[PDB]
Amino acid sequence: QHLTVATLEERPFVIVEPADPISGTCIRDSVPCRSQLNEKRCCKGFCIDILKRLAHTIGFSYDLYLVTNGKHGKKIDGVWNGMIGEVFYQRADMAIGSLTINEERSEIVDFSVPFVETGISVMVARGTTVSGLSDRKFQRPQEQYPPLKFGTVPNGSTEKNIRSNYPDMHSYMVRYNQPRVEEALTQLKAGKLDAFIYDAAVLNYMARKDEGCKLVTIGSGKVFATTGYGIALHKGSRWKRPIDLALLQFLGDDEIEMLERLWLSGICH
Numbered sequence: 240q241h242l243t244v245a246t247l248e249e250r251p252f253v254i255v256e257p258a259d260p261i262s263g264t265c266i267r268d269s270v271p272c273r274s275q276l277n278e279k280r281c282c283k284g285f286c287i288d289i290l291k292r293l294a295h296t297i298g299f300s301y302d303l304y305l306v307t308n309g310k311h312g313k314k315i316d317g318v319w320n321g322m323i324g325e326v327f328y329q330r331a332d333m334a335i336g337s338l339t340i341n342e343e344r345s346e347i348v349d350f351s352v353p354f355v356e357t358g359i360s361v362m363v364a365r366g367t368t369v370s371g372l373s374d375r376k377f378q379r380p381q382e383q384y385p386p387l388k389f390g391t392v393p394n395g396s397t398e399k400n401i402r403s404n405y406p407d408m409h410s411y412m413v414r415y416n417q418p419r420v421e422e423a424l425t426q427l428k429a430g431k432l433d434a435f436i437y438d439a440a441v442l443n444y445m446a447r448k449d450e451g452c453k454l455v456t457i458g459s460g461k462v463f464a465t466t467g468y469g470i471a472l473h474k475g476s477r478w479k480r481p482i483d484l485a486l487l488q489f490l491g492d493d494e495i496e497m498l499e500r501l502w503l504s505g506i507c508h
């Protein structure tokens with residue numbers, strides 16, 4: 240069969256590039272992907288490598304598109320956007336990327352088994368002195384004269400988690416919302432942020448490849464639950480079982496571990 244697949248750029252899980260200007264095609268290991276709004280684009284990365292393996296193992300063809308209506312998935316006044324919205328409203332058969340499994344989402348779409356471990360971590364400059372996410376600097380923040388400056392990228396599972404588990408801290412953080420990881424790290428490297436709270440799998444990767452190894456993460460410890468990325472599918476989808484079996488097979492064949500090495504490794508430790 241042929242599946243429609245929604246995705247979203249977040250390096251290095253999904254990396255988007257123009258087609259090779261010489262051949263006009265997607266060269267190397269990249270695959271064609273178009274925009275939801277619709278210039279030819281190509282996608283590659285850890286999740287794209289997973290997607291290629293699923294299509295070959297299970298035997299489906301697919302067209303892949305980039306979501307423009309929001310990002311991962313947020314429910315605003317009864318309506319979902321992002322990758323979750325695409326699957327929920329049956330515009331796509333599945334969505335794959337750095338898509339975190341949570342309770343709110345699982346209520347409305349099915350997820351595959353998780354294939355990347357994630358959660359919530361905090362990034363700080365290697366210099367900054369702060370304990371972790373238990374710290375009062377984070378929790379009770381207007382309690383300091385020049386308060387700690389820390390933010391996240393809003394509208395994802397991280398912000399949902401914080402606003403739900405730590406409502407007081409959330410109303411403070413909102414001032415320090417960032418549009419993308421790229422901007423957050425820039426602000427963090429410049430003192431405009433003291434800390435950046437974000438998806439663990441992505442943040443841990445950013446630290447591992449930070450130029451000069453000047454940025455480090457601290458783990459949430461007990462402050463936040465461990466979770467995973469999963470492929471989103473229609474509630475009741477016939478595709479969940481075969482996708483699961485394939486993923487479980489990759490996970491024990493050492494194919495996922497290989498992909499981890501390929502995509503997610505860095506020089507800093």
Ligand SMILES: CCCc1cnn(O)c1[C@@H](N)C(=O)O
Pocket residue numbers: 310311312337338339340392393394395396397398437438
């Ligand atoms: C644009 C938000 C990105 C983000 C922040 N936290 N988490 O978990 C995500 C994303 N992985 C998600 O699934 O919402």
